């Protein structure tokens, strides 16, 4: 029970929060990409009428 | 053609909550996360110290 336990636990505590984190990150870089599909969509529909 | 702009619109809109939303939930999981973190800068300082103190060997 040295306080090991204890001191670990935390750091188990972090790469949980530190890897939960990433998925965050992840989730924001996917919803911008379509963001930004639909901004080239919107892009190439306003070429595709200049003509 | 007149149908499609909303469409466009709706989806905008949709992914724009969505990022918000991510970036908020980023933004109080990094919060927790720095706390996590300076509470271990002191767990491990704070034995790091009856360690070294009461002798050192090895």
């Not at chain 1, 990433?22 to 070429?47: P, S, Y």
């Amino acid at each position: 029970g040295a306080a090991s336990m204890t001191l670990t636990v935390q750091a188990r505590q972090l790469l949980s929060g530190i890897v939960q984190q990433q998925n965050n990150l992840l989730r924001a870089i996917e919803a911008q990409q379509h963001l930004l599909q639909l901004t080239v969509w919107g892009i190439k529909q306003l070429q595709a009428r200049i003509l | 053609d007149d149908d499609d702009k909303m469409e466009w619109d709706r989806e905008i809109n949709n992914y724009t909550s969505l990022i918000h939303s991510l970036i908020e939930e980023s933004q109080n999981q990094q919060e927790k996360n720095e706390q996590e973190l300076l509470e271990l800068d002191k767990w491990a300082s704070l034995w790091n110290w009856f360690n070294i103190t009461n002798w050192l060997w090895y």
